[PDB]
Design an enzyme around this catalytic site. Sequence first.
Site, mmCIF file in Angstrom:
data_model
loop_
_atom_site.group_PDB
_atom_site.id
_atom_site.type_symbol
_atom_site.label_atom_id
_atom_site.label_comp_id
_atom_site.label_asym_id
_atom_site.label_seq_id
_atom_site.Cartn_x
_atom_site.Cartn_y
_atom_site.Cartn_z
ATOM 1 N N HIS A 52 1.496 -6.278 0.678
ATOM 2 C CA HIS A 52 0.855 -5.304 1.497
ATOM 3 C C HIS A 52 -0.113 -4.387 1.062
ATOM 4 O O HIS A 52 -1.024 -3.468 1.467
ATOM 5 C CB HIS A 52 1.912 -4.433 2.323
ATOM 6 C CG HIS A 52 2.697 -3.562 1.394
ATOM 7 N ND1 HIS A 52 3.506 -3.821 0.510
ATOM 8 C CD2 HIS A 52 2.312 -2.169 1.190
ATOM 9 C CE1 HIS A 52 3.685 -2.775 -0.289
ATOM 10 N NE2 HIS A 52 3.162 -1.995 0.177
ATOM 11 N N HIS A 94 -3.814 0.259 0.400
ATOM 12 C CA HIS A 94 -2.396 0.174 0.874
ATOM 13 C C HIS A 94 -2.329 -0.021 2.467
ATOM 14 O O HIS A 94 -2.744 0.767 3.194
ATOM 15 C CB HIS A 94 -1.606 1.218 0.527
ATOM 16 C CG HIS A 94 -0.285 1.425 1.004
ATOM 17 N ND1 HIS A 94 0.412 1.297 2.171
ATOM 18 C CD2 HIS A 94 0.978 0.862 0.219
ATOM 19 C CE1 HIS A 94 1.568 1.334 2.240
ATOM 20 N NE2 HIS A 94 1.967 1.084 1.076
#
Lengths: 489, 489, 489, 161
Positions: D68, D83
């Site tokens: 991710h 992020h």
Amino acid sequence: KYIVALDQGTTSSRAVVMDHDANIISVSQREFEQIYPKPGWVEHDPMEIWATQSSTLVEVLAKADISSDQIAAIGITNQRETTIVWEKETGKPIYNAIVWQCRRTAEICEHLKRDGLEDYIRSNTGLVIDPYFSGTKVKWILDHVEGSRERARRGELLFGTVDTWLIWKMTQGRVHVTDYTNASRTMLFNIHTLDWDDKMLEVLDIPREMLPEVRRSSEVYGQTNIIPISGIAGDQQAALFGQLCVKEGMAKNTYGTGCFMLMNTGEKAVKSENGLLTTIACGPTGEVNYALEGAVFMAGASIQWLRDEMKLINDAYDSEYFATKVQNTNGVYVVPAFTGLGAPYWDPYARGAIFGLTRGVNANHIIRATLESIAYQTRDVLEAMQADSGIRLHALRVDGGAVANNFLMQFQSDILGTRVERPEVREVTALGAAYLAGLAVGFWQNLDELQEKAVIEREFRPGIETTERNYRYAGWKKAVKRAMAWEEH
Amino acid sequence: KYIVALDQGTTSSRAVVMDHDANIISVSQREFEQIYPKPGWVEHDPMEIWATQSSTLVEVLAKADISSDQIAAIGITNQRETTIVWEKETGKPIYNAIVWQCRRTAEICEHLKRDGLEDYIRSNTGLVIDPYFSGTKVKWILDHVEGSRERARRGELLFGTVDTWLIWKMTQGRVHVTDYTNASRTMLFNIHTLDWDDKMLEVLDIPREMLPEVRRSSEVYGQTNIIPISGIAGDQQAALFGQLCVKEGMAKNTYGTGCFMLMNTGEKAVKSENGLLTTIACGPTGEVNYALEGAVFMAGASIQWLRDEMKLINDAYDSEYFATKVQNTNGVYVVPAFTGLGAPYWDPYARGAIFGLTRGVNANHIIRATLESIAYQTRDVLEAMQADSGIRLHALRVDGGAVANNFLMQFQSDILGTRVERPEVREVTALGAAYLAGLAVGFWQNLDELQEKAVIEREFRPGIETTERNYRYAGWKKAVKRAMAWEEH
Amino acid sequence: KYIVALDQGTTSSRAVVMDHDANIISVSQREFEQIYPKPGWVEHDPMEIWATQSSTLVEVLAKADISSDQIAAIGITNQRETTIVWEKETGKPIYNAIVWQCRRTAEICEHLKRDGLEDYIRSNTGLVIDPYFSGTKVKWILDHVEGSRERARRGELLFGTVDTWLIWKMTQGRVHVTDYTNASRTMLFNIHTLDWDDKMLEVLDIPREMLPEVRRSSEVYGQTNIIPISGIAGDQQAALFGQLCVKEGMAKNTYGTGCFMLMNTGEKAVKSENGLLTTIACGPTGEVNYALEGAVFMAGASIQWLRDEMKLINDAYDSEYFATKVQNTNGVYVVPAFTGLGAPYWDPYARGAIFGLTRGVNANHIIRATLESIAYQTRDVLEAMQADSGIRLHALRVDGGAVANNFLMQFQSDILGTRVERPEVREVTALGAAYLAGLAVGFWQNLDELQEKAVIEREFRPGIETTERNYRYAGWKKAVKRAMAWEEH
Amino acid sequence: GLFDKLKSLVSTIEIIAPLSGEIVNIEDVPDVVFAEKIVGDGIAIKPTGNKMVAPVDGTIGKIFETNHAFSIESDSGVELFVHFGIDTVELKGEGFKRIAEEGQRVKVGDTVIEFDLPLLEEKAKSTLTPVVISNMDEIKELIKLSGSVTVGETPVIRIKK
């Protein structure tokens, strides 16, 4: 398209896939047993050498989904000296591979000296009467198995160092070939005449029927449905080519199982008078150049003994951590003569030893002394190299598995009092064999298309501790003089 | 003449040469990697399973100088459940062998329950919806690779558990066959109809084109130029045959990677209501009998984790020494649910755990608790066995690598409060597969010619410490209840 | 001139010589046994506590050639709670020091709850009914030895935590004194009235004749011919003074055997409603301030268990190296409840546990999880601290033996998502006791002459890995919920 | 249809949008290390289409193993951190196919991660994607842009050094 390199080590089998301009696209390592029948003895099973080196070949391609179609050629690097005698029909050895390390043929070696064949073998092979070379190892296999020297002339059994055993298994029996660098190592091959020496072949009662076709290191030798096999070279001679050393006075030192330092000496064979070897190596197009050589038998193998036998470390890599926890070895010296010394000493009768032990010496003092003996052995051959060549090296270009250790590399430059240039592709033994193969297939045409890749990742310089280098080294030379000649004969 | 047995384990490959009346004349073991991609997951490379199992075959004969001519037949024992899907032309898998241990297909398993297919799969396969069986493992390989279910009907790819992968490599592609004991394990095969169940095959969208020819465990299936392949059986079902169990109520427990206890139940399929399996096993001539089974996933593998990962012991054998240096585990329990529990619990979501730690608990308390969990798991299935069968065992006939440990065997008889009969040929898995093979070739004609060989080397009886067996076991059942259902879903 | 500090730990005895403006001029550490009679139990021999703490005192001075003449005063820091009952004439205990850790008095503790004395002991001592405090520990010694409660009123035997045992041995029996911080810990002393609580003293049938004279933490109490003893404080309350915390909302966390986080709350006693303690600590001149406290029992002691019992590391310091070789713990959680939990949980019945084990979990995954549980325990008390105080900390000022570990300090700031300010004199427990002593003798007059010394050597900030802090912490809270309530009662 | 083998309309440090969507203030990001500038400072993006791209020309420092998130080092001495969403390691991989390599040389617009936004909107607690300079000691001024951005095209930040 790609070039496949088949690197076959003393302790492992590596195959690596390489694209145009040397990128390691894929790699495979596979370990195999080390067999120790008697203490001084070392041995491999040729079938495990083949089992791993074939499965490694099928790994790398599968990893990267590639097969036959895309591969221009196959180069071969191999551990030198270890003799193999097998069956021509079947493809079954009459014995285990006796390794380069193995000391059993020391008895034979002692007779060759008591005759007076040392000035002969020195001056026509460039080598030294030692258990290390294949000459005496074949005689031993022959003298011990039953059929042997009659099945020999009748031609049912074949000699081979690891380069010729692997191709005879790859071409289903078709081609039986050496290259010049590997044949130089056997003590059966004249280095000036460039053909098998037959005073040697006499003396060791080896039939000439056993021997391979000695060929160039860059030449298509046959094809395999693995497709052409075009490069062959002894692993350290392909490390010298991978370093692109290739010109007069160009040298490297490889830190693998042992440490092997070699300097290219052009198209001149220099006579050593400080304990070294005169061997054959490649030139820029894969042609016979000569090279000076110092070979020490134990180096990364000592770090392997700490880990597997001795159990003091778990990772070979944890030796750096524990070695740099103590500042010195507290007077302790490890002399790693596990299979004799060799190096500049030759003497097959020395075994390993740890000296100057005290009540407060701990495991880290042993671990650091073991790493330190790799740098003291490198200095013993390096000054033999310099006194032989008449050239002083102002940097030591290095490679091998062990150069990843910063303590060892730095300690190395302090004890030598010279810089230590590390490259970033450190295992260059499988590149010299890929270059020898690419060249013979037209994949490359020559070395200048490959200058760019030698990029020195780090240069180690002698820090202030280099001032004690001769106090520490004098301690090692006392330790070595006591490990010598332990075994009786 | 001789019979060759090819035993292919979870962690190793064994081939053993046997003469007339079961003498182990020669043996070969060869280890291979265990691949762990995600934590709950386990995996093998089918090529390393083939690489070792072929080289082991070529070892045993060479050791004893024997080849083709002298060998009457070849039997095959193998780790059960691990699915393999490969390419028919090439002989190349579209994926690694997903092992019996591996827990990735728990998601699939949860859907099969939310439908209502548990009473179906229970009553027609004798099995339980778990990640353990091959059914769901094939669906996973299919659902994840691209070509898969179209190359499937087009027939380019083949399913196989390890028995059918090894013969398809031995007969160069010719025969593609299972036996009944191995097929019983896949959850795709009806156990009453004795053919592939096709409500299952529907549900998991597996094409029937992939599947092997299910055959007897004692039958010539093909020949190999290794010469006839005549015995096949899942390793624990051949351990039951090697124990000559073969009649109603006859049982054994094998201590290998896991512990598998099986009782022959004649020509009756008994329904378990205490967490066990209803499987297929052989009768006296190699015919379908049924058997009750309890399978615990970790047993000698736990002792292997202490040694390789954990580094607390160096030899699996040094666990006896260190376990008997402390008299008890000082309240410590190791629950070895490294790949779920299974056993009578099933629950794929439990992971391993060490409970009741205190400031003075040392490494020997952990080592002894690890060996002790092997005996507590054996008691969990044994009382499920007794409550299922309605028979109380008055001795436990055992075999496997771990029964060489006297502490474990003795501790086992104290916690069970029953005798533990150890045989002197302890690794009987490769004998049940040699017997199945000898019988089908006429080398033996039947089992009574082999009664004589079962000679109990030692019988362990409950000493005075058996009086605390229920205090110690109650502690284990508290520990197990806390390792359960750790992983979320 | 110099100040001598006598630091007496759970596992060691330290004496340090200090000049004017806090320079550590000399130090001495001396380890002593930890006695474990039953599993939940911990114990020390008061004579070994005296043997080491006296010899340490004679070491530091001799090292620096100093004696009596030059030393202005002697301060005392000590492990809190561990009860000792000895003989007034002889100077011989009727039992071993039962440690703060020890869980034997849990039975007594359960009765005090079944009565209804929890709201009493909470609101008048600031403490919680736990085995941790000395209250119940004295009752146990009394109830188990013969003479006990009659020799008690007759006055032949004396109570003491380690501060009062050490001074009674230093002044040959003359003075029998506590200070306020140490007495707050016993559960026999009212924290509002500042004298021994006598509903408590009733309930635990302790005679008031046993008890010390509770005095200030900065006061000359007597002289010793070691010369005046002027500072006394519980080790964590002297760590708070050494940090110069001393004002409202000022906090520290000490990483010693356990982790103890304390926040000074002025001259107000705040009622905790999130599992913490209301204790007594010093103000700028050595006067009663209050403080909130969270105490977790295992922290550097866990790292000590890896090394001595478990043998996985050799140096406590090698845990950093091995913890940073794996990037994560691979789902593994170590819950270090070796002597119950306590912390915000209280529950004396939990024992230690390692969860989520898998086949590829190795020793480094255990070592890193052990260090990680020190940072997860610190977060459990820190958010209980913040929810209690109503103050959010924007940096965590830390000290103790364990803060020398950069992995732990950094991992600590990532899981907290706050900065971690490390000082360069890290073992500040012996400075808070030197400051309390210097002040009472005029060697210093006050704290502002000592601001300058608090110099933050390093500040740790949350790197990008702080983004997973709540995924990793949620795993710990699942692990803790399963270690809880293991022991039966 | 997909247009990747198809040619594109190409044309004082700028940080190009790692992904498309609306620029959102980082203090609106509901995880206090972002909302309060702790881990770094920069902006957030409410994402609208399936790839995550190299926001500057530089080397990939590290891709988290759950895929991710990633770290990049620009050649101009800047270190960014992208992020996707908050608490997205809990997904254990679900929705993310990693494309670039852990320590790879990338030019702007180079795909580094592909994601499955329908899944990710249902499951992740928040889909807001922080792109922050983690190197913030070293940069003197930080200019923050606003509105719509398109992956590999639109500028989000202007840092001066």
